[PDB]
Design a protein around this nucleic acid. Structure first.
Ligand SMILES: [Mg+2]
Ligand SMILES: [Mg+2]
Ligand SMILES: [Mg+2]
Ligand SMILES: [Mg+2]
Ligand SMILES: [Mg+2]
Length: 1354
RNA sequence: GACGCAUAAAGAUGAGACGCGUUUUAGAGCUAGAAAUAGCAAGUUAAAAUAAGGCUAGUCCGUUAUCAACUUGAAAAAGUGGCACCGAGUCGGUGCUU
DNA sequence: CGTTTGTACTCCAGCG
DNA sequence: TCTCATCTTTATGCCAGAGC
DNA sequence: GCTCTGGCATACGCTGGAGTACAAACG
């Protein structure tokens, strides 16, 4: 009557099993409902629920943000049109109407078919005058003639619609820049300020640096060569301050007006200018030379007087494209006339015709045309431009993403300045148009909702509609920025109504320090035993060396404190290894700013400091920080406040202020922090304080603490794990309902946790700074010398990848820029679209235009061959792992293939861990509910949490081998073995319940301490060995390294009680028998499909009924549209259809797929929807919703799952005998058995003896296929391939036979191969047969069934 | 030693932006041609849409999570299916029992 | 003799 | 692809009396 | 004034839609 439940939870499965006290799996006769004649089923209480993994909300988020961007871009254009509308009605009242309907075909257009001018001659003239929009933009920027209002609008709308990025702050003005020759003005101003005969007659200016790769190196070299200045500052020192960042932390080179340091023109650079403004403008030349150099870096146009450098560069692209195209056409005609049509007319090839009119990108076009160019004559210039990626370029390409918005804003401002003379309305609202271009909702404001958004947090000062021009006066930006962070930070778990403290708050730092400090012990020569630090000693230590050293080493503690004050000549410290992990970093940072130490040490102003740190953590906008800190301006100097607003903290703690310093124990009146600072002689740390029954902290925490669906929905984190959590809780609930509504004795959950040796865990958690040091020193570069870095700074992804690559690009042999890292981007070696892998082995820092031409593919063979030596250098120095090197060189081993797809992603382990950890506490809360006064909670049900290592060792030791490829039974079997091993362990060692049973621990149970011996190897190694040896009571012979063996008893008893725990004779037979049960309740969860309506690709117009209109009024036969709609669910319709040459009502039964788009339309009124679909006399009461994976049973027990309205998945399981599974496991893995050499030899001999099982397994597969798969051609191919390779080695034959189970695997048909022969999918693309099958409705465990015989519907 | 701290791996959630891509239309094709076609010219750009759409009409929302069947119900939610034994090719049989 | 469903094979899927 | 912010799981290191 | 958890010894899963060609197969 007592029973246990095992669980094997995964991302797409939850295996479950019910066991009794004798480890047997029971079986019950279950009632089956429905109209069939079958009334009872015998079923074993073991099975697995399979489901589609919950998707992360990332793709939905990306779609939502893209939708918002499109909405706001349309709104920008609407604002511009509203500005232009009144004065456009003068010149062309239908202009904006023609712009709106430009998409429509001519018979749909209500106006003239030429959008801009509305007549053929003017339109042709315009396009001859301005072949590209950039011609018009440059003409409007440069010319003084009154232009047409329509042309002005077109240029401004092009700038506003495609307005460039906002990755650069400040005003990158073009008017006071773009001429690098103003360096002469820089040396002129230097000559004015520097009177000791400075250098003025220099050589060539920085144009040489620009013509080379831009860095500190070429700048220094060219300035040394051309500018032999009288001092370092003039020749090199000041120029970089106008063009580059400075690495050293020391003050700048020899002073010119003041001695302080120098930095590039950043956000804080203006305030840093006190070294000259308070001493004198030489530094004003930064705002000119810096912008000139930067825009010369962005754009390859500096030789022209134009005020539109971007439009000029695009016109140069156009001109070079034209010239190169003419030359290429001439060369092709005079050398390769037969190839002319292919290159220039056939747009299915990747020639120029496919480059312009086809789908060929310029990488495809270049790889097509490079062989052509190489074999002709006179193509040297074209080839050079090709290798430089500037051959026949388009004006709108992937690499335009580096254009800042300031360039477009400059062109727009120039146009408005030019044309405001003639159009007064342009002068009145020049700033409105500029604001339309430049306005951008702050990231901390979010969507500008008015109540009906679940993603919005913005608060508004007034009810006015928000525009770009009243955004400041309508949106409360301070409160919005506060709620931006406040809605994302955690609440204190102990006090769930109190927000956690900032990670860098002073109370949090003190709490951490004293929590670590309260447990360190010292022993002297004369002291009997190690003693705690007293409250006075902890006070003294903190004041002496925690408030004077940022990092406190044990050496400092035993030399600065103990030796010097309260003298001990030699002391031993326990409770810290080499350095206190705790620190007071915020104290030192605020001591640097506020030189007053007494202010920080004072206790009255603790609230002020907490508020200051909270402000510095919530906001990064210097204006908001200044406004918030302004209330304290009477406590600090103006300079001190200027320094505070620079200080920026991020990160939040785990505990609230009310917890660590707010609540008081009613007896002693002490807070938790007061106890940490002085707790008599007990010196309780944080976890002891909140768990003592003698103190009221535990009571206050406990008293400060619906439905299952609501509870799972309200869980924080990814919604991906909610699916697994809810499904396993529902499985447990159904299993409890089956077993007479009696709660299980135990629930055993397989956890993905692991015990590691201390060496492995210390090597896998080593600091990344250490990794960079050890790698750089190996290859000998001075990258750390040039750019010193700390481990904390390496949390930045791009900064970390910079040093991992030795400061070099991994795709082009070029050096990266540290200060300009935002203009590089992180590239996923194996593309995101293929496989989800965000690991460091997959990430590479490369240049933006290198990434964006390298689209959704591994690096090309050209890149691999160029870079294989540098990658080899990095691999030998261990900055990239072997897996990273394999990812980079993927093109050398055949590129992307389904083999790469066949491997668990790393997110799956994290998802499994999260699901299992959540469900452990969910089940512990739902099962154990009866509270008791003597002991708080009554543990009716023990939720055992087994590590996966135990069951895997059980399988491998006792030959219960697992092969995931044969069938889905391994989930249920893993659950069964989990139940067996967990219950056996709890019975044999009832004193391990504190660590295996969820929540049954007492804090710091010293009873389970490890002696000093066996700790010299490491505390985690001792636990690793303990857990390894804790499972030896299952085995009989325990073999030693020297050959001695202990024979364990055949019956294992509890030891103290004497209850039988494991009869090694009969219980192993019980386990073996259960793993050979052919009936296992494998159920695939039926799921109504949700997601995208169809495939996202817009297809060209086609006379087909599969196309879907992409707007309501756009006929897809004229405009194109989407196809491949996703079927939400199918419906079984029984009705009459008018068909035949003479249409007549023939009664029909069939499945109609209700796609996601039309799901709501169908659910509003099914009869109207079906009649409009063409069904007459629909029987409303016979409509059956059939979601995906609906199960039908046919003759000979053949089962099919509904993939869609016109496809079926195979729905049977191959219960292969356990002997064949073991033989497949042993024959494969032939030399990687990992056992003793004698055992490996014995297993190899067994495999060799039983080589006849290959024929037996093939017979199993063939009969199973002939019965349920019915893929006769594929089966014949499989049999022929097996007969061909029957003389291959047993290992290879067994390895390839495991692929054959892809033929029989439940689910969608998949392709597989047998040593070379690829067997492709036999898809069941007809759902006519299931219309007379038996529709199976299965409960969550599949034990409860309803069988509907569809042959009786008609 | 399930809290906390330090380190690290692997992931997650939300907001703000960029650049492409696709689709239809505009960018007068010319000559020889009954013409089917052939020769030549040309190409780089733009508008609009970018889940159909929705109503609470916001510069908002629309692809995550929730879903066996049946009976109750405005819905959350509740309720529905006997046991033991011998066996095992996807569960069968036997015997008690309602 | 003309449609009309089964097989069978190929291709494709927005992205950086 | 970029910027900003927050959060989770797991591993290792430090943290362990006490009644008989 | 001490052994205790134990025995005494260690290195997580994966395809449906659409088109085209061709052959039975019904009307
Ligand atoms: Mg598992
Ligand atoms: Mg990429
Ligand atoms: Mg599993
Ligand atoms: Mg879904
Ligand atoms: Mg821990």
């Amino acid at each position: 009557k007592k029973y246990s439940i095992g669980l094997d939870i995964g991302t797409n499965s939850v295996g479950w099993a019910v066991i009794t006290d004798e480890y047997k799996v029971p079986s019950k006769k279950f009632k089956v409902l429905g109209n069939t004649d079958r009334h009872s089923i015998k079923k074993n209480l073991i099975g697995a629920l399979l489901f589609d993994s919950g998707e992360t909300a990332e793709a939905t988020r990306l779609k939502r943000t893209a939708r918002r961007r499109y909405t706001r871009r349309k709104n920008r254009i609407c604002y511009l049109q509203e500005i232009f509308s009144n004065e456009m009605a003068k010149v062309d009242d239908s202009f904006f109407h023609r712009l709106e309907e430009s998409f429509l075909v001519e018979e749909d257009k209500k106006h003239e078919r030429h959008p801009i001018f509305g007549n053929i001659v003017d339109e042709v003239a315009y396009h001859e005058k301005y072949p590209t929009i950039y011609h018009l933009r440059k003409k409007l920027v440069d010319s003084t003639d009154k232009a047409d209002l329509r042309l002005i609008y077109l240029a401004l709308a092009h700038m506003i619609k495609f307005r460039g990025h906002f990755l650069i702050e400040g005003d990158l003005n073009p008017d006071n820049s773009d001429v690098d020759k103003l360096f002469i003005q820089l040396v002129q101003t230097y000559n004015q300020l520097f009177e000791e005969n400075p250098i003025n007659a220099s050589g060539v200016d920085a144009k040489a640096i620009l013509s080379a790769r831009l860095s500190k190196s070429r700048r220094l070299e060219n300035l040394i060569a051309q500018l032999p200045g009288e001092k370092k500052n003039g020749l090199f020192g000041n120029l970089i301050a106008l063009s580059l960042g400075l690495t050293p932390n020391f003050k700048s080179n020899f002073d010119l007006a003041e001695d302080a340091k120098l930095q590039l023109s950043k956000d804080t650079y203006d305030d840093d200018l006190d070294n000259l403004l308070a001493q004198i403008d030489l530094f004003l030349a930064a705002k000119n030379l810096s912008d000139a150099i930067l825009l010369s870096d962005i754009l390859r146009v500096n030789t022209e007087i134009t005020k539109a450098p971007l439009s000029a560069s695009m016109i140069k692209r156009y001109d070079e494209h034209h010239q190169d195209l003419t030359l290429l056409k001439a060369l092709v005609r005079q050398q390769l006339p037969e190839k002319y049509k292919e290159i220039f007319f056939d747009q299915s090839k990747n020639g120029y015709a496919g480059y312009i009119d086809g789908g060929a990108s310029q990488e495809e076009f270049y790889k097509f045309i490079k062989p052509i160019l190489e074999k002709m004559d006179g193509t040297e210039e074209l080839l050079v431009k090709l290798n430089r990626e500037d051959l026949l370029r388009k004006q709108r390409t992937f690499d335009n993403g580096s254009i800042p918005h300031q360039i477009h804003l400059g062109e727009l401002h120039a146009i408005l300045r030019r044309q405001e003379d003639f159009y007064p309305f342009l002068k009145d609202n020049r700033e409105k148009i500029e604001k339309i271009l430049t306005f951008r909702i702050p990231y901390y404001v979010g969507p500008l909702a008015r109540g009906n958004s679940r993603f919005a947090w913005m608060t508004r000062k007034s009810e006015e509609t928000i525009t770009p021009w009243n955004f400041e006066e309508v949106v409360d930006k301070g409160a919005s920025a506060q709620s931006f962070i406040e809605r994302m930070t955690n609440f204190d778990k102990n006090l769930p109504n109190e927000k956690v403290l900032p990670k860098h708050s002073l109370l949090y730092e003190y709490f951490t320090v004293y929590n670590e400090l309260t447990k360190v012990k010292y022993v002297t020569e004369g002291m009997r035993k190690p003693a705690f630090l007293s409250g006075e000693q902890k006070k003294a230590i903190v004041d002496l060396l925690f408030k004077t050293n940022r990092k406190v080493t044990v050496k400092q503690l035993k030399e600065d404190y103990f030796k010097k004050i309260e003298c001990f000549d030699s002391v031993e410290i326990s409770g810290v290894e080499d350095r206190f992990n705790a620190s007071l970093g915020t104290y030192h940072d605020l001591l640097k700013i506020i030189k007053d130490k007494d202010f920080l040490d004072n206790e009255e102003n603790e609230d002020i400091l907490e508020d200051i740190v909270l402000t510095l953590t919530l906001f990064e906008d210097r204006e908001m920080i200044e406004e918030r800190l302004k209330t304290y301006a009477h406590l600090f100097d103006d300079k001190v406040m200027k320094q505070l607003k620079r200080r920026r903290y991020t990160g939040w703690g785990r505990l609230s202020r009310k917890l660590i310093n707010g609540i008081r124990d009613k007896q002693s009146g002490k807070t938790i922090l007061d106890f940490l600072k002085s707790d008599g002689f007990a010196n309780r740390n944080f976890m002891q304080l909140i768990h003592d029954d003698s103190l009221t902290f535990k009571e206050d925490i406990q008293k400060a603490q619906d439905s299952l669906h609501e509870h799972i929905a309200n869980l924080a984190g990814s919604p991906a794990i909610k699916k697994g959590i809810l499904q396993t809780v529902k499985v447990v609930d159904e299993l409890v309902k089956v077993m007479g509504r009696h709660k299980p004795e135990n629930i055993v959950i397989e956890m993905a946790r692991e015990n590691q040796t201390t060496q492995k865990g210390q090597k896998n958690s080593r600091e990344r700074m250490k990794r960079i040091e050890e790698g750089i020193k190996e290859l000998g570069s001075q990258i750390l010398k040039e750019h010193p870095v700390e481990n904390t700074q390496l949390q930045n992804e791009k900064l970390y990848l910079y040093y991992l690559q030795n400061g070099r690009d991994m795709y082009v042999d070029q050096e990266l820029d540290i200060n300009r890292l935002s203009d590089y981007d992180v590239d996923h070696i194996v593309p995101q679209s293929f496989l989800k892998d965000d690991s460091i082995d997959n990430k590479v820092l490369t240049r933006s235009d290198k990434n964006r031409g390298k689209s959704d593919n591994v690096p090309s063979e050209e890149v691999v061959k160029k870079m294989k030596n540098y990658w080899r250098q990095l691999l030998n120095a261990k900055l990239i792992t072997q897996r990273k090197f394999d990812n980079l060189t993927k093109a050398e081993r055949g590129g992307l293939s389904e083999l790469d797809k066949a491997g668990f992603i790393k997110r799956q382990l994290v998802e499994t861990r999260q699901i299992t950890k959540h469900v452990a506490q969910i089940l512990d809360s739902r099962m154990n509910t009866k509270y008791d006064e003597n002991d708080k909670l009554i543990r009716e049900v023990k939720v055992i949490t087994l590590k996966s290592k135990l069951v895997s060792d059980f399988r491998k030791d006792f030959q219960f081998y697992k092969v995931r490829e044969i069938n889905n039974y391994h989930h249920a079997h893993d659950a069964y073995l989990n139940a067996v091993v967990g219950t056996a362990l709890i019975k044999k060692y009832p004193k391990l319940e504190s660590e295996f049973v969820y929540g049954d621990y007492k804090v710091y149970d010293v009873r389970k301490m490890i002696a000093k011996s066996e700790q010299e190897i490491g505390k985690a190694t001792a636990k690793y060995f303990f857990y390894s040896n804790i499972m030896n009571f299952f085995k009989t012979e325990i073999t030693l390294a020297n050959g001695e063996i202990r024979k364990r008893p055949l019956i294992e008893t509890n030891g103290e009680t004497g209850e039988i725990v494991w009869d090694k004779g009969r219980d192993f037979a019980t386990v073996r028998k259960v793993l050979s049960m052919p009936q296992v309740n494998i159920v695939k969860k039926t799921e109504v499909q949700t997601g995208g309506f169809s495939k996202e690709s817009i297809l060209p117009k086609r006379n087909s009924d599969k196309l879907i209109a992409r707007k309501k009024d756009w006929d897809p036969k004229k405009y194109g549209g989407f196809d491949s709609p996703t079927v939400a669910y199918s419906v079984l319709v029984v009705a009459k259809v008018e068909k035949g040459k003479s249409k007549k009502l023939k009664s029909v039964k069939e499945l109609l797929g209700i796609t996601i788009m039309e799901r709501s339309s169908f659910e509003k009124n099914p009869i109207d929807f079906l009649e409009a679909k063409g069904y007459k006399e629909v029987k409303k009461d016979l409509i059956i919703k059939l979601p995906k994976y609906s199960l039908f049973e046919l003759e000979n027990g053949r089962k099919r799952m509904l993939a869609s309205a016109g496809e079926l998945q195979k729905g049977n399981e191959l219960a292969l005998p356990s002997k064949y599974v073991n033989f497949l496991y042993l024959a494969s893995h032939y030399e990687k058995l990992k056992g003793s050499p004698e055992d490996n030899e014995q297993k190899q001999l067994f495999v060799e003896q039983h080589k006849h099982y290959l024929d037996e397994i093939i017979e199993q597969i063939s009969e199973f296929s002939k019965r349920v798969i019915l893929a006769d051609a594929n089966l014949d191919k499989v049999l022929s391939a097996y007969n061909k390779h029957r003389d291959k080695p047993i290992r290879e034959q067994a390895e390839n036979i495991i692929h054959l189970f892809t033929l029989t695997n439940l689910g969608a048909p998949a392709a597989f191969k047998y040593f070379d022969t690829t067997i492709d999918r036999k898809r069941y693309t007809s759902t006519k047969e299931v219309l007379d099958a038996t529709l199976i409705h299965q409960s969550i465990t599949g034990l409860y069934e309803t069988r509907i015989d569809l042959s009786q519907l008609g």
